[PDB]
Amino acid sequence: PNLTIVVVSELLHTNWTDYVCLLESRFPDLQINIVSAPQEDALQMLLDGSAQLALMFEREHLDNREQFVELKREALIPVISKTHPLASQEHVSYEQILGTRQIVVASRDETLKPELLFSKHYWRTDNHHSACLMILRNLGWGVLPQEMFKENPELNNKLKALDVFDFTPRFEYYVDLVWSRESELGAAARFLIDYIRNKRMQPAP
Amino acid sequence: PNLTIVVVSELLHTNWTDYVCLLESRFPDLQINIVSAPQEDALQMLLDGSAQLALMFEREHLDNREQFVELKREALIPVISKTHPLASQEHVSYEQILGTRQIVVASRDETLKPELLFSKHYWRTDNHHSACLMILRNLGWGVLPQEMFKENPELNNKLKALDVFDFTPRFEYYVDLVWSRESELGAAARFLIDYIRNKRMQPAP
Ligand SMILES: [Br-]
Ligand SMILES: [Br-]
Ligand SMILES: [Br-]
Ligand SMILES: [Br-]
Numbered sequence: 130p131n132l133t134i135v136v137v138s139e140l141l142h143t144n145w146t147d148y149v150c151l152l153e154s155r156f157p158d159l160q161i162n163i164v165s166a167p168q169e170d171a172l173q174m175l176l177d178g179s180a181q182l183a184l185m186f187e188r189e190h191l192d193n194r195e196q197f198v199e200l201k202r203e204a205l206i207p208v209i210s211k212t213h214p215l216a217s218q219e220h221v222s223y224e225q226i227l228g229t230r231q232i233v234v235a236s237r238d239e240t241l242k243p244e245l246l247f248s249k250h251y252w253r254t255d256n257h258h259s260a261c262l263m264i265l266r267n268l269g270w271g272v273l274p275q276e277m278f279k280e281n282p283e284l285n286n287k288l289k290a291l292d293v294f295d296f297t298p299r300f301e302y303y304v305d306l307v308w309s310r311e312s313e314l315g316a317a318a319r320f321l322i323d324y325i326r327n328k329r330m331q332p333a334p
Numbered sequence: 335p336n337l338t339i340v341v342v343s344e345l346l347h348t349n350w351t352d353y354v355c356l357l358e359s360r361f362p363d364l365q366i367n368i369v370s371a372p373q374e375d376a377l378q379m380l381l382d383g384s385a386q387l388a389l390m391f392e393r394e395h396l397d398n399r400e401q402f403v404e405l406k407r408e409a410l411i412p413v414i415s416k417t418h419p420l421a422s423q424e425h426v427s428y429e430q431i432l433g434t435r436q437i438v439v440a441s442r443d444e445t446l447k448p449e450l451l452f453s454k455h456y457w458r459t460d461n462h463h464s465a466c467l468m469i470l471r472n473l474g475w476g477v478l479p480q481e482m483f484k485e486n487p488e489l490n491n492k493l494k495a496l497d498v499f500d501f502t503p504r505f506e507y508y509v510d511l512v513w514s515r516e517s518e519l520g521a522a523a524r525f526l527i528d529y530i531r532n533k534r535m536q537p538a539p
């Protein structure tokens with residue numbers, strides 16, 4: 130038997146590893162395959178049974194074919210390379226961001242969210258590691274998961290948060306654990322879902 | 335009017351950012367989209383017109399519609415967490431490798447290279463970041479791009495090479511720039527291809 134979990138691309142550089150450790154401790158002979166896909170493909174994988182669980186960040190596309198349980202919120206920060214021309218400057222004006230290249234993460238142009246584009250020109254990539262590498266080369270600025278800074282403490286030396294966004298709503302993902310309602314859940318999947326639901330604190334009666 | 339380059343999943347941690355910088359200095363208005371995909375899907379994208387260029391490793395089934403030029407070799411290192419039980423020892427024995435879970439990267443079970451499985455049990459993931467995270471949780475050992483230690487010097491402090499592989503031939507990728515013979519290439523793609531080919535040093539007459 131095996132358990133395949135699809136982590137939507139945008140959530141790769143997030144915190145899913147705790148769930149894998151839980152599963153591995155409880156099922157020491159289980160084969161756990163961690164794969165990644167656009168959210169659109171992730172959902173189809175749940176429908177045709179190639180994945181048993183998905184980590185996703187948007188309920189908008191969810192029909193009732195899907196069931197889910199809320200997980201943690203993941204924080205993202207707008208950053209720029211400290212050696213970028215705009216970085217010498219004490220602060221980046223909102224005109225300067227309007228005129229600088231933004232590196233955006235999205236599965237395709239179609240899935241680009243306009244309220245999150247702040248520059249007139251942008252490049253699109255489908256994962257935060259690619260975005261991060263290009264920002265590091267001074268090719269632009271963009272929004273990265275705070276977790277990346279935990280994974281790689283040298284990034285603080287090389288990247289700088291953009292203060293100009295301090296009076297703007299924070300960038301974040303709300304992460305759900307999603308499965309197919311029609312599926313017959315395996316023991317490991319049921320263990321994890323039950324674990325997450327049971328660990329939530331409920332109001333006193 | 336835009337250039338989409340697909341980097342196959344296995345190569346996300348290589349020096350592909352050099353090629354992007356060359357493109358952007360020469361075409362300051364070009365939209366460059368860096369996407370990633372399984373090697374099988376990437377060839378399909380070249381044929382579809384989804385992508386103009388692909389960074390690929392050794393293709394299993396050659397197609398006459400593809401054309402390529404060789405780029406770097408990328409070195410891989412077999413590693414284990416410094417906090418894994420086996421790491422305390424001076425050396426890990428062949429038997430111990432055989433009995434510890436290997437974290438392997440491949441687009442699916444069938445594209446696993448059986449010559450690179452050294453353990454009875456393994457987990458499959460589709461990219462090296464995911465593999466790295468799990469190795470850092472002591473869930474197994476596995477092979478990672480040497481470049482990941484350059485991107486993140488921290489890993490030097492958390493992982494160690496397994497010298498039990500010292501008498502084994504080194505793990506590497508042969509990386510090719512690939513395009514479609516039938517697709518016609520924009521100016522940006524042609525410029526990169528020509529640049530690669532003409533930068534090669536040629537033997538004296
Ligand atoms: Br088990
Ligand atoms: Br700033
Ligand atoms: Br241009
Ligand atoms: Br591997």
Ligand SMILES: [Br-]
Pocket residue numbers: 424425426495496497498499
């Ligand atoms: Br060793």
